[PDB]
Paper text:
Rae1 is a messenger RNA transport factor that can anchor to the Gle2-binding sequence (GLEBS) motif of Nup98 (Nup98GLEBS) at the nuclear pore complex (NPC).
ITC results quantitively described that SARS-CoV-2 Orf6CTT interacts with the Rae1–Nup98GLEBS complex with higher affinities compared to SARS-CoV-1 Orf6CTT, which is consistent with the results of the GFP pull-down assay described previously. To better understand the molecular basis of SARS-CoVs Orf6 inhibiting mRNA nuclear export, we determined the crystal structures of SARS-CoV-2 Orf6CTT–Rae1–Nup98GLEBS and SARS-CoV-1 Orf6CTT–Rae1–Nup98GLEBS to resolutions of 2.8 and 2.5 Å, respectively. Both structures were solved by molecular replacement in the space group C2, with four Orf6CTT–Rae1–Nup98GLEBS heterotrimers in one asymmetric unit bearing virtually identical confirmations. The sidechain of a conserved methionine (M58) in both Orf6CTT inserts into the hydrophobic pocket made up of residues F257, W300, D301, K302 and R305 in Rae1, which provides high steric complementarity and buries a large surface area. To evaluate the contribution of Orf6CTT M58 to Rae1 binding, single point mutations of SARS-CoV-2 Orf6CTT M58A and M58R were generated and examined in the binding assay.
Residue numbers in the entry:
A (entry chain B): 158 to 173, 179 to 213
B (entry chain A): 25 to 263, 266 to 365
C (entry chain X): 53 to 61
């Protein structure tokens, strides 16, 4: 539980027709976190004192 | 730098990051603002027409406050918290009592005033949506959600709940709350915020929904050509540059009560104003040194309140307890008028 | 500010 794993923005692609490369600047976009919400993770950190 | 928009700061702002904002109803004279924080408190300021803020009262949960709302008469403030309970807070007496209990944190709280009933609706990570009369310890009604509740909104006779795993459900509220439609969600990533908008006759007619991938969906309940009338649009992104685009999370969405235009606030530390009928971007703020965690309007739409707070978008390592949180006020009535 | 078209998906 918590955000023990380092934050690392996932890479992706979007269109703007030409594709462009993107970085997902939100931790829960990661595969290690994709099944939880921001608030869910933060509470888990607070309850463990990982501030 | 902390306040790039040169907007008004609410004096005596919360000690920890702000999770929710809420303005008093029009049945109250003047304007009163409520904010819950991650320091477990609920606070109330009186905003004055000159712009000065006066702290009026504060209550306490045993865990972070995730949502707050008012009662139609403006006498009671309802609070929802990670301590798995929700409270009714009588301002005049400054006392607060428990009115709801869940098995997980309580993410959302709303007041339903129907012609024939009144109750508090709570949506929780225990996957339930419950309704309370504020007198009984037993909930009046309990409905099961498809997964954990992430955000919700209510404008009688309609309610919208969004959950983990793209769960999206509309509720009809006339007489008794009931499930109206389970929507195949227009968004493909985590739901985060939802706000209901009304048609030209003040009738709730659809909602706006924000995900973590810099996208908001416009969803009409019953339009004539849903393929063209419903749409998503990109927001809270970076950019003339070939460097990858940075995509931030949509943290709050609120509609201006008279103009029908909308505001979104994002983990990118900006707010943007939008016209969803013209499909245009009216304004984007400058960047703040931390995310904008929440926003809302006052009753007549003459105060736009937004909260500068970390939102855990990058996890625990980027939290600075050292760094201060703010609530900013902006008169954006003219800024949000269409055309 | 400067009204601009939205980036509709």
């Amino acid at each position: 539980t918590g955000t023990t794993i380092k934050f690392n923005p996932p890479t992706g692609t979007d269109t703007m027709s030409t594709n462009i490369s993107t970085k997902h600047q939100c931790i829960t976009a990661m595969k290690e976190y994709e099944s939880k919400s921001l608030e869910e993770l933060r509470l888990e950190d607070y309850q463990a004192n990982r501030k | 730098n902390h306040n790039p928009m040169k907007d008004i700061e609410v004096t005596s702002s919360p000690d920890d990051s702000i999770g929710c904002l809420s303005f008093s109803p029009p049945t109250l004279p003047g304007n009163f603002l409520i904010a819950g924080s991650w320091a477990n408190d609920v606070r109330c300021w009186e905003v004055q027409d000159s712009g000065q803020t006066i702290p009026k009262a504060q209550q306490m949960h045993t865990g972070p406050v995730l949502d707050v709302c008012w009662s139609d008469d403006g006498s009671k403030v309802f609070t929802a918290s990670c301590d798995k309970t929700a409270k009714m807070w009588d301002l005049s007496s400054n006392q607060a009592i428990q009115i709801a209990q869940h098995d997980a944190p309580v993410k959302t709280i709303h007041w339903i005033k129907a012609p024939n009933y009144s109750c508090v609706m709570t949506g929780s990570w225990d996957k339930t949506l419950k309704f309370w009369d504020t007198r009984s310890s037993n909930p009046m009604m309990v409905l099961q959600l498809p997964e954990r509740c992430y955000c919700a909104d209510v404008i009688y006779p309609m309610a919208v709940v969004a959950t983990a795993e793209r769960g999206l459900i509309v509720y009809q509220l006339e007489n008794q709350p009931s499930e109206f439609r389970r929507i195949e969600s227009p968004l493909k990533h985590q739901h985060r915020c939802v706000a209901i908008f009304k048609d030209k006759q003040n009738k709730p007619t659809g909602f706006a929904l924000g995900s973590i991938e810099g996208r908001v969906a416009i969803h009409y309940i019953n339009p004539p050509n849903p393929a063209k009338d419903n749409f998503t649009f990109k927001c809270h992104r970076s950019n003339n540059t070939s460097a990858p685009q940075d995509i931030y999370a949509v943290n709050g969405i609120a509609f201006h009560p008279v103009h029908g235009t909308l505001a979104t606030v994002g983990s990118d530390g900006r707010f943007s104003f939008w016209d969803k009928d013209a499909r245009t971007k009216l304004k984007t703020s400058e960047q703040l040194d931390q995310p904008i965690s929440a926003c809302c309007f006052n009753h007549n739409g003459n105060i736009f309140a937004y909260a500068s707070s970390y939102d855990w978008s990058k996890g625990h390592e980027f939290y600075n307890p050292q760094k201060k949180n703010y609530i900013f006020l902006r008169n954006a009535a003219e800024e949000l008028k269409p055309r | 500010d400067e009204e601009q078209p939205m980036e509709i998906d």
